[PDB]
Amino acid sequence: ANLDPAEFENTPQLIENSNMTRLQIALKMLTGDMDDIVKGLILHKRAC
Amino acid sequence: ITNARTNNDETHATGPIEDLNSTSHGREPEIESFADRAELAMMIQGMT
């Protein structure tokens, strides 16, 4: 500390904090219920 | 030994049967069957 000025102790903030919100929005949207992929099913013949 | 990437006929096993247990003859035909088609495709109909 105190040689490395203040903010070299970790990964550096690349994306601006404002843009981070826009990122989060799109993420939450496209991963929510609007998803489509679905797993598993069952084959069986019935006349119902 | 020789090879053949052939699957549209047999043309490789030929000969006369000599006993009801003979295992090296040609090929004889089979019962003449019919269509019997019923796919499994999510609400196919009757065709009875």
What lies within 8 Å, CB to CB, of B4 at 6+ separation is B12
Burial pattern A5-39, b for ≥16 Cβ within 10 A else e, equals eeeeeeeeeeeeeeeeeeeeeeeeeeeeeeeeeee
User: Residue B48 is which amino acid?
Assistant: T
Between CA A33 and CA A36 the distance in angstroms is 8
Between CA A4 and CA B4 the distance in angstroms is 73
DSSP state at residue A9: S
Cα Rg for chain B, rounded, in angstroms? 19
User: Residue A26 is which amino acid?
Assistant: A
- For residue B25, the tally of other CB atoms under 10 A from its CB is 13
Experimental determination technique: cryo-EM
